[PDB]
Coordinates of C-alpha atoms and ligand atoms in Angstrom, one line a residue:
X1 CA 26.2 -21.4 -8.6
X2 CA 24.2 -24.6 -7.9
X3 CA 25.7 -25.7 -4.8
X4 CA 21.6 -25.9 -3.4
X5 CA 22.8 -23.5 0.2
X6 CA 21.2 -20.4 -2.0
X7 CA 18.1 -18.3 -0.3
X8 CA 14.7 -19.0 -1.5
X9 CA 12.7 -15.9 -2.1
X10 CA 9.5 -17.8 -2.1
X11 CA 9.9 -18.7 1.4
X12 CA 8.3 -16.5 3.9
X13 CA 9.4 -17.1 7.7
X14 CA 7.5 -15.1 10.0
X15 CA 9.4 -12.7 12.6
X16 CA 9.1 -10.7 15.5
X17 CA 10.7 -7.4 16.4
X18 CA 8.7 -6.7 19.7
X19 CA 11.6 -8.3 21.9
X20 CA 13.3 -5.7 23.9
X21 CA 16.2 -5.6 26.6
X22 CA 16.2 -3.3 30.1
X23 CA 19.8 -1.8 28.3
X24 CA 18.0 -0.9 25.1
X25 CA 14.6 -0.6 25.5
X26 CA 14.1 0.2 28.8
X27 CA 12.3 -2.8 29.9
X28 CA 12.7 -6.8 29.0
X29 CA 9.9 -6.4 26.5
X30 CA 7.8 -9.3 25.4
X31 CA 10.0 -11.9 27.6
X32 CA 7.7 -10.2 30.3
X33 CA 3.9 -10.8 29.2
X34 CA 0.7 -10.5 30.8
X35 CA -1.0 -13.9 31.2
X36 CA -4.1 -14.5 29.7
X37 CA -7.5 -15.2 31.6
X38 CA -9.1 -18.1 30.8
X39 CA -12.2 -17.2 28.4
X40 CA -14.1 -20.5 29.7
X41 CA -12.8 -19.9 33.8
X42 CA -15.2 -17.0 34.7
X43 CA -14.7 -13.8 36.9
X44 CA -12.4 -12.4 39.6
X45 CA -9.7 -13.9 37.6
X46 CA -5.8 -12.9 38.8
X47 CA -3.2 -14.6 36.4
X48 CA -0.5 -12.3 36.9
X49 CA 2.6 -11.5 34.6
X50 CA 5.5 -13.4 33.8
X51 CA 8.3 -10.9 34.9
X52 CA 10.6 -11.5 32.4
X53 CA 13.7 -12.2 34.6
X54 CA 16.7 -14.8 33.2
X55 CA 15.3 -17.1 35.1
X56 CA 11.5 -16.8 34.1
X57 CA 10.7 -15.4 30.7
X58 CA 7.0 -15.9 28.5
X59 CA 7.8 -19.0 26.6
X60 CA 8.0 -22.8 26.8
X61 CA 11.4 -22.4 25.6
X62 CA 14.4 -20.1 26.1
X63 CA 16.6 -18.9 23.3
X64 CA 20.1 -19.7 22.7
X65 CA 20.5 -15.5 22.4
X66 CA 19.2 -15.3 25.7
X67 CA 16.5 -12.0 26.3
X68 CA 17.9 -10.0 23.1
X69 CA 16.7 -6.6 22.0
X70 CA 14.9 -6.7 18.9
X71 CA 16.6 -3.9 18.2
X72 CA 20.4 -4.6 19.3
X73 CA 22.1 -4.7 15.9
X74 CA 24.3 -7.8 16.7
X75 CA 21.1 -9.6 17.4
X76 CA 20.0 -8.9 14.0
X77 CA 23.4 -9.4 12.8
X78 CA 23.3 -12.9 13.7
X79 CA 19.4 -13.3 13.1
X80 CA 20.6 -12.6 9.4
X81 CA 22.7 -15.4 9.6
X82 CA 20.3 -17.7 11.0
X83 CA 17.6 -16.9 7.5
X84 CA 21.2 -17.9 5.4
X85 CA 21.4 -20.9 7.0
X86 CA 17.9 -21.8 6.9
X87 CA 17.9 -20.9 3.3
X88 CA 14.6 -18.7 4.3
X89 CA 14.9 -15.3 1.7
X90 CA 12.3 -13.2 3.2
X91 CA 11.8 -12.2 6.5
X92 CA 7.9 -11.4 7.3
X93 CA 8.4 -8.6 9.5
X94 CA 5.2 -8.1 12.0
X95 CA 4.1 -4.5 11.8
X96 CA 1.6 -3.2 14.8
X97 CA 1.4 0.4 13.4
X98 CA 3.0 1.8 16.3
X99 CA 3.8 5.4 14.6
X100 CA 7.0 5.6 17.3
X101 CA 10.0 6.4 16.9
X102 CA 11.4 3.0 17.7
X103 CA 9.6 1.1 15.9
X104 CA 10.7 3.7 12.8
X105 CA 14.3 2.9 14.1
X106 CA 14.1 -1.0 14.5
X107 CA 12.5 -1.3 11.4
X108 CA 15.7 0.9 9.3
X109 CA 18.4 -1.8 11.7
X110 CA 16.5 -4.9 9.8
X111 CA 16.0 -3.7 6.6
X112 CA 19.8 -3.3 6.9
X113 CA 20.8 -6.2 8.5
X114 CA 18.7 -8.4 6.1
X115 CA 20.4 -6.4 2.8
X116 CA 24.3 -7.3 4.2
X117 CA 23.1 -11.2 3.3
X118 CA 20.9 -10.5 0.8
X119 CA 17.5 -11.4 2.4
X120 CA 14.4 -9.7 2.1
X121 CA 11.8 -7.8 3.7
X122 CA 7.9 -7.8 4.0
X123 CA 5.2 -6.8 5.9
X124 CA 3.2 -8.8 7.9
X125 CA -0.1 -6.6 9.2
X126 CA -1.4 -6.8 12.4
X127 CA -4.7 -6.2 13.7
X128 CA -4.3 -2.7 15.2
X129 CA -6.5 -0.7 16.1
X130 CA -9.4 0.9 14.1
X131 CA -7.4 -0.7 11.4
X132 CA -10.2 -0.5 8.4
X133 CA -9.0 -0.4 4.4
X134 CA -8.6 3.2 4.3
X135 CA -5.7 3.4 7.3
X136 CA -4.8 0.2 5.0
X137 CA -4.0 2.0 2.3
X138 CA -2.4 5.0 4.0
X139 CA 0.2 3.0 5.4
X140 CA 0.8 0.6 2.5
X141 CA 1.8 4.2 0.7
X142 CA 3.4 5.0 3.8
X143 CA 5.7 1.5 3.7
X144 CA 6.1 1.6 -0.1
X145 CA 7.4 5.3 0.3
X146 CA 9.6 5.0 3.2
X147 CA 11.2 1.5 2.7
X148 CA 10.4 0.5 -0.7
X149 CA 13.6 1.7 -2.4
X150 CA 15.0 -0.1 0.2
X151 CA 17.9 -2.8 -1.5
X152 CA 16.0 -5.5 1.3
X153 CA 12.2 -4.3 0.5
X154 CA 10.9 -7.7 -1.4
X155 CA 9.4 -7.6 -4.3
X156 CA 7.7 -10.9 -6.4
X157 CA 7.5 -10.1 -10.3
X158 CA 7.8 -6.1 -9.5
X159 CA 4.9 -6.3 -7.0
X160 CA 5.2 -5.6 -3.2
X161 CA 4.2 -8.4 -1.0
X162 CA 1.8 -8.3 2.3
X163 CA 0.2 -10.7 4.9
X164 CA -3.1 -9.4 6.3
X165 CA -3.6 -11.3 9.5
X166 CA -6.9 -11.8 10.5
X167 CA -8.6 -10.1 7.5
X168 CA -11.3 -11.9 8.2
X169 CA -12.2 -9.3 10.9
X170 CA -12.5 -6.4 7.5
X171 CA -16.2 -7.4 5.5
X172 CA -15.0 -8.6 1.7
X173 CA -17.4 -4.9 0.5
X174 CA -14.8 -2.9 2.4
X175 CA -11.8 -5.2 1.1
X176 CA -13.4 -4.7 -2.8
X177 CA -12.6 -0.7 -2.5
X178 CA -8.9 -1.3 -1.6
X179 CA -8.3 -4.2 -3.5
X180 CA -11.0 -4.5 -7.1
X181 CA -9.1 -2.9 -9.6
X182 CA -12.4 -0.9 -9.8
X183 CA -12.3 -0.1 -5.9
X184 CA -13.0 3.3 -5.1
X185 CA -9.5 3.6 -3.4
X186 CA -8.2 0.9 -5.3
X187 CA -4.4 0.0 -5.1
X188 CA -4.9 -1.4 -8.6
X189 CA -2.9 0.2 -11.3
X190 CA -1.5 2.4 -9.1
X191 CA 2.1 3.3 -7.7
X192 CA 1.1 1.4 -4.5
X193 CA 0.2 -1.9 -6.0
X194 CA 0.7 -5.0 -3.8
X195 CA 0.0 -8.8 -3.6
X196 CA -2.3 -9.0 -0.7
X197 CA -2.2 -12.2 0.8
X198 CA -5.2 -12.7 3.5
X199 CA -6.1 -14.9 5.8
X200 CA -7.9 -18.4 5.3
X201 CA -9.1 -19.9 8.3
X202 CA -12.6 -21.7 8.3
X203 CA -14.0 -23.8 5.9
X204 CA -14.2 -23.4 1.9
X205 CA -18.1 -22.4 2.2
X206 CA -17.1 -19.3 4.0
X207 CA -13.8 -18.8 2.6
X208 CA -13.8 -19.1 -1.2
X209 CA -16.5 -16.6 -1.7
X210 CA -14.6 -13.7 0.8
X211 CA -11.4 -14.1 -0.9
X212 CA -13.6 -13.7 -4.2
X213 CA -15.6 -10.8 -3.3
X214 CA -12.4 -9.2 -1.0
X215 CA -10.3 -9.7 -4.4
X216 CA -7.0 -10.5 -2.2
X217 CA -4.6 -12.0 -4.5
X218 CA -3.7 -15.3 -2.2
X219 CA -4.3 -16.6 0.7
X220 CA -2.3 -18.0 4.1
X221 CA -2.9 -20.2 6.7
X222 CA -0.3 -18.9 9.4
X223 CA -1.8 -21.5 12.1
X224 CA 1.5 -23.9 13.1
X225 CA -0.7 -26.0 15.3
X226 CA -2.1 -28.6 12.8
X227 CA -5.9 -28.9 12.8
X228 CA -6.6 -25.5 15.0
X229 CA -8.8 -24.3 11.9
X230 CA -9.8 -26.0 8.5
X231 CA -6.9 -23.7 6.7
X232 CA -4.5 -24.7 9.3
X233 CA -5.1 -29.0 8.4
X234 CA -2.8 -30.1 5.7
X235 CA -4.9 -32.6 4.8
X236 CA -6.7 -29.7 3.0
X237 CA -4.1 -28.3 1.7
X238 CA -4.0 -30.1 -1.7
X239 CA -7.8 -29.2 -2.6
X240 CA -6.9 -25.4 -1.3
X241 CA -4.2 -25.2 -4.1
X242 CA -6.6 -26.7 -6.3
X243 CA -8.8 -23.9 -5.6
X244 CA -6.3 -21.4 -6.0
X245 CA -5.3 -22.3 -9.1
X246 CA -8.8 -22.5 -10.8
X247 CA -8.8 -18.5 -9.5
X248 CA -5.8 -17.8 -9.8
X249 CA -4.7 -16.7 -5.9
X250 CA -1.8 -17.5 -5.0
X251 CA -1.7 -20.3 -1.9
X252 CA 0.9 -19.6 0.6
X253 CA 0.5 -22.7 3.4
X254 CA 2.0 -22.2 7.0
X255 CA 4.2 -24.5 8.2
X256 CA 5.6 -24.8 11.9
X257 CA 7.8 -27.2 14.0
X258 CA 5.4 -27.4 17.0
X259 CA 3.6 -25.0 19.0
X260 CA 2.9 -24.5 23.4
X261 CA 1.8 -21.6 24.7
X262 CA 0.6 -22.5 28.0
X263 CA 3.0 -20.0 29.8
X264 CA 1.4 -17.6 28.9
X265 CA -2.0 -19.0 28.0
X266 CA -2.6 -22.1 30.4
X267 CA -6.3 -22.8 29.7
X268 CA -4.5 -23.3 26.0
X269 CA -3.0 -26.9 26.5
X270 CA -5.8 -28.5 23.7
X271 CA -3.4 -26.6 21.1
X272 CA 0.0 -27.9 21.8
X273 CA 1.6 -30.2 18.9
X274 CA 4.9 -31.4 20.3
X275 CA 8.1 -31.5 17.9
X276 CA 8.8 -35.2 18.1
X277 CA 12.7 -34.5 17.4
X278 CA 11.4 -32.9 14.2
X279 CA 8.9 -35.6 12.9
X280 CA 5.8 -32.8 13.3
X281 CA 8.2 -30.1 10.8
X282 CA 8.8 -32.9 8.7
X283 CA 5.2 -34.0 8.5
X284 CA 3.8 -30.5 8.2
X285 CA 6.6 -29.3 5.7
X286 CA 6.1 -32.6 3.1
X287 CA 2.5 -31.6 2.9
X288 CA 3.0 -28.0 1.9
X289 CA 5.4 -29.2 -0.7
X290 CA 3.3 -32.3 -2.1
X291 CA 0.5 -29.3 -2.4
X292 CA 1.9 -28.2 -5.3
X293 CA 1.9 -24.5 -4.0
X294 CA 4.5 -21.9 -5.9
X295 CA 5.6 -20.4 -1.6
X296 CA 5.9 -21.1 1.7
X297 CA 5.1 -19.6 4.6
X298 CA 7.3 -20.7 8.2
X299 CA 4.8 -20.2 11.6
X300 CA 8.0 -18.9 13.3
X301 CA 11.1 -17.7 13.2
X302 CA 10.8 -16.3 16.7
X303 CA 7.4 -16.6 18.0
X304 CA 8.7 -17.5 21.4
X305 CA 5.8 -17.7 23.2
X306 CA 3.6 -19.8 21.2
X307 CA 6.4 -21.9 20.7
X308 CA 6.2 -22.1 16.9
X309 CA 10.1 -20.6 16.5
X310 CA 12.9 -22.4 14.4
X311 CA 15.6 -20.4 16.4
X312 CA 17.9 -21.9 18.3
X313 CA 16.9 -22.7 21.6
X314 CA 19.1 -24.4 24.5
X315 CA 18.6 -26.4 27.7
X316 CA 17.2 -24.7 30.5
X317 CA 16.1 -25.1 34.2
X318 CA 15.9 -22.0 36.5
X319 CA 14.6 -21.8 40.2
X320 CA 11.4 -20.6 38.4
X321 CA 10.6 -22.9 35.5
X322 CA 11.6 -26.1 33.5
X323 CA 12.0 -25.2 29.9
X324 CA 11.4 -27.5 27.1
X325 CA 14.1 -27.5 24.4
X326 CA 15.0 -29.2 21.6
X327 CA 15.9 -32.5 22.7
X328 CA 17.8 -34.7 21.1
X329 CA 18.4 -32.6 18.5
X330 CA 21.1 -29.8 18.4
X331 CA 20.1 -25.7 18.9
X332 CA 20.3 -24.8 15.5
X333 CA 18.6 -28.3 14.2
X334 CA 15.3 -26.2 13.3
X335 CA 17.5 -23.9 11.0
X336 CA 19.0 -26.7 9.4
X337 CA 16.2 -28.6 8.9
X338 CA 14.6 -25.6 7.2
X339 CA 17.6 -26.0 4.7
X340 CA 16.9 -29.5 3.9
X341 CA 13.1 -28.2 3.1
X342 CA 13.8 -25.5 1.5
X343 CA 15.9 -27.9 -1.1
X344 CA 13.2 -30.3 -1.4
X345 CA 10.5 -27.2 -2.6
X346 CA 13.0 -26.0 -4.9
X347 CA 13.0 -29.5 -6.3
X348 CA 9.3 -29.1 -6.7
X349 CA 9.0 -25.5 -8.2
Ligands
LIG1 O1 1.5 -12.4 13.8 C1 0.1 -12.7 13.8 C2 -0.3 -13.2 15.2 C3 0.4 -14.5 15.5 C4 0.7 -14.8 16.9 O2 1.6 -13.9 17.6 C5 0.2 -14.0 18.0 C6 -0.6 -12.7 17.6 O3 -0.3 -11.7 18.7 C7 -1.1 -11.9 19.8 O4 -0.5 -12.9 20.7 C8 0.8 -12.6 21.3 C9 1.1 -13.7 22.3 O5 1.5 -14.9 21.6 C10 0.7 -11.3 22.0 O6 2.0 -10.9 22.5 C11 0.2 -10.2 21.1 O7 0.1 -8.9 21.8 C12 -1.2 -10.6 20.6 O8 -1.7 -9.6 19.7 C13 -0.2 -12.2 16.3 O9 -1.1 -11.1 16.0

């Protein structure tokens, strides 16, 4: 077919699985959140917790789905159906190494869910704790065993696919045993071979020579908030593929429709980039795609409370809070939008 609604499978869009309901997980996970203290507002700080109740949940905006379980299969059903009509073909799954049984559980419903439409799974690694290469490598092996015969598991020219965010906080010495085909517990040649796609944040001085010397085989910029870091300005973003292609790492930019945080974070106001009825997506996305770069990366699907998500969201005023929504566009504008990008890369490619 060439009717231009097919998935792209070079089209990354980052998602969450950390939401949870009091009927399936016990508790209204992640639509409660702490908020943060101020860094800059000093001691004896209180800021409390959103609760989480319908009326007063930890984002600017409040989903069409209302407070869903991450792991309520009719969610994902419909979440599935969302990535078809955004055209987006692989879901980057955030994984927090939380060696639980529901985590084991949610993970099985997507990888499912995603295979009934044809969409595809990767791994997006968090910052957990102690993380260091070695525990890297064990639970690359670990995902490659468990899920990698997996009809959803993605795979780019036979290779498995991972984000490392904030790799930066792993020295490029430690990275070069994991990730030089020479390392001492090298991936390389081996069974558990991966594209490793790390972080770039600051500027080319710093960043070149640590994706060099930590041999990662790309590099993203996940930021949606235009200019919060050198990586993150897409006026950059043309001499960064340049770059990459003179080394040959793959460049996978991050594009977002807008971002706000300050219900959870309200010392954070600097960051917010309002959506402008889709002008900033549009803005953001044209750049990534006059780049030149071979895949995208989409800063959110559903990161609710930083306000980056393309799900639908819907009007909203409680007793408790005022929520922004999408305006004078429609709930699903974000997914269709996508769509129309999505189209105008595979133009480009
Ligand atoms: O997925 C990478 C990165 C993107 C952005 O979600 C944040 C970050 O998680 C931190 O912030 C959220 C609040 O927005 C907290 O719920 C998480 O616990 C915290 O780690 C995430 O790592």
């Amino acid at each position: 077919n060439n009717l231009g609604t097919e998935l792209d499978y070079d089209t990354f869009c980052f998602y969450y699985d950390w939401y949870g309901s009091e009927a399936i997980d016990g508790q209204y996970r992640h639509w409660a959140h702490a908020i943060a203290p101020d860094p800059n507002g000093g001691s004896g700080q209180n800021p409390g917790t959103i609760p989480g109740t319908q009326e007063s949940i930890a984002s600017n905006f409040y989903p069409q789905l209302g407070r869903y379980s991450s792991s309520d299969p009719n969610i994902l059903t419909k979440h599935m159906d969302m990535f078809v009509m955004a055209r987006t073909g692989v879901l980057a799954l955030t994984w927090w190494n939380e060696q639980d049984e529901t985590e084991a559980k949610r993970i099985g419903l997507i990888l499912d869910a995603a295979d009934k439409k044809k969409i595809k799974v990767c791994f997006h690694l968090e910052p957990y704790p102690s993380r260091n290469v070695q525990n890297l490598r064990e639970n690359i092996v670990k995902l490659i065993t468990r899920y990698g015969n997996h009809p959803a598991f993605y795979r780019k020219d036979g290779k498995p696919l991972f984000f490392i965010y904030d790799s930066y906080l792993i020295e490029p010495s430690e990275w070069e045993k994991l990730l030089s085909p020479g390392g001492s517990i090298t991936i390389r040649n081996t069974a558990y071979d991966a594209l490793m796609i790390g972080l770039w944040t600051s500027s080319p001085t710093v960043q070149r020579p640590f994706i060099l010397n930590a041999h990662f085989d790309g590099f993203y910029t996940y930021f949606a908030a235009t200019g919060f870091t050198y990586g993150s300005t897409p006026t950059n973003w043309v001499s960064m593929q340049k770059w990459a292609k003179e080394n040959g790492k793959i460049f996978i930019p991050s594009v977002g429709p807008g971002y706000i945080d300050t219900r959870i974070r309200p010392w954070n106001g600097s960051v917010i980039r309002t959506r402008t009825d889709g002008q900033y997506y549009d803005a953001m996305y044209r750049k990534a795609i006059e780049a030149g770069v071979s895949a995208i990366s989409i800063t959110s699907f559903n990161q609710w409370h930083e306000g980056s998500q393309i799900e639908p969201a819907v009007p909203y005023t409680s007793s408790e809070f005022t929520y922004l929504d999408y305006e004078n566009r429609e709930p699903d504008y974000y997914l269709t939008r996508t769509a129309y990008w999505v189209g105008k890369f595979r133009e480009s490619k």
